[PDB]
Design a protein around this ligand. Structure first.
Ligand SMILES: Nc1ncnc2c1c(I)cn2[C@@H]1O[C@H](CO)[C@@H](O)[C@H]1O
Ligand code: NA
Length: 350
């Protein structure tokens, strides 16, 4: 049955007591009462089938979340769709109900040094598990960090994730959407090198800076304006850092730039723990090759109160895409989706 203002939710009879929460990109988001687990849950109504790009993101998220198990990563409790592929044009993903997200909270609260500390630890702990699976989130930002308490953070939205391929660099600038602009590492914008774990560390860096001041550290209007913001704080890059600029066209808008001095961090963030600011510096390195890696970040003195390699799981097996799906007809992907969501349909054998 089921309804809720406007668009009606083909959930139930399991899920009831609906109550609109918010909006997704191409789907709605309510909270329901799960009458099996006897708790309130969140249900994402997803209809992506019209543009093939939406079916990529939806399929990637399901395949990845369905194989990940980690306490700082959202899971999929239930997927429910129509019986017939032909009859399927919505898909409902059931996930644990979370109270808010780091974006919503940064709109209403400055965070103590302490809370920031264990928020960052939980981010990197989940990131450690993602990277050990040979996976890149690629869209880490505050609104993709769901929060229940200061001790319950879960990374969500794996719509842009990729298996890591330092070699799969394609140099297609407009060929891919990689990171929301404010959290996009420089090598993405300079080389189109969006297949290395370095890009996620940059994003986390940006999140750390945003926690320290409640405002995003590099808020560019467009990709070139994003670079001016980066250089305005980091400063004009070195010769060596202009050597990993493969886009031979890219070295120019740089070279035709007025040298900018490096803004000392304690000047940007004078109330922040000097240890926070040291880690920030390792994470916001212009050159991907010199940027700190996730396990090194966890080991940083700033997180020494929580670091515990024995209580930080890694993936049992590197992840693998059974067939790459960049250029697949959008009805093939809807096929592949109907397939992957078969787990949660009656009679599913094997
Ligand atoms: N599990 C959840 N619990 C609570 N809210 C959720 C979710 C999920 I998945 C999504 N949302 C809503 O989408 C925003 C993050 O993109 C969130 O801020 C929210 O508007
Ligand atoms: Na999401």
């Amino acid at each position: 049955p089921e309804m809720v203002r406007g668009q009606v939710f083909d959930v139930g009879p399991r899920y009831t007591n609906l109550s609109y929460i918010g909006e997704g990109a191409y789907g709605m988001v309510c909270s329901a009462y799960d009458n099996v687990n006897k708790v309130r849950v969140a249900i994402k109504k997803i209809s992506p089938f019209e543009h093939q790009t939406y079916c990529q993101r939806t399929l990637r998220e399901i395949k990845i979340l369905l194989r990940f198990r980690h306490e700082n990563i959202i899971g999929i409790n239930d997927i429910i769709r129509a019986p017939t592929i032909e009859q399927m044009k919505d898909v409902y993903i059931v996930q644990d109900l979370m109270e808010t997200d780091l974006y919503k909270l940064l709109k209403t609260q400055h965070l103590s040094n302490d809370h920031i500390c264990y928020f960052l630890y939980q981010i990197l702990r989940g990131l450690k598990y993602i990277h050990s699976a040979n996976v890149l989130h690629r869209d880490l930002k505050p609104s993709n960090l769901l929060l229940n308490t200061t001790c319950d953070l879960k990374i969500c939205d794996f719509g842009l994730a990729r298996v890591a391929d330092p070699d799969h660099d394609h140099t297609g600038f407009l060929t891919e959407y990689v990171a929301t602009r404010w959290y996009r590492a420089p090598e993405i914008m300079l080389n189109s090198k969006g297949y290395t774990k370095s890009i996620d560390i940059w994003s986390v860096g940006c999140i750390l800076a945003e926690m320290l001041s409640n405002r995003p550290i590099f808020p560019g209007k467009h990709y070139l304006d994003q670079l001016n913001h980066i250089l305005g704080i980091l400063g004009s890059p070195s010769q060596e850092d202009l050597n990993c600029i493969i886009n031979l066209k890219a070295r120019n808008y740089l070279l035709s730039l007025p040298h900018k001095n490096k803004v000392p961090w304690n000047r940007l963030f004078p109330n922040a723990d000097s240890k926070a600011l040291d880690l920030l510096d390792k994470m916001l390195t212009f050159n991907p090759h010199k940027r700190i890696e996730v396990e090194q970040a966890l080991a940083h003195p700033y997180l020494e109160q929580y670091y515990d390699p024995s209580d930080e799981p890694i993936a049992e097996a590197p992840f693998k895409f059974d067939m790459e799906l960049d250029d697949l007809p959008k009805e093939k992907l809807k096929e592949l989706i109907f397939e992957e969501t078969a787990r949660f349909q009656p009679g599913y054998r094997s």
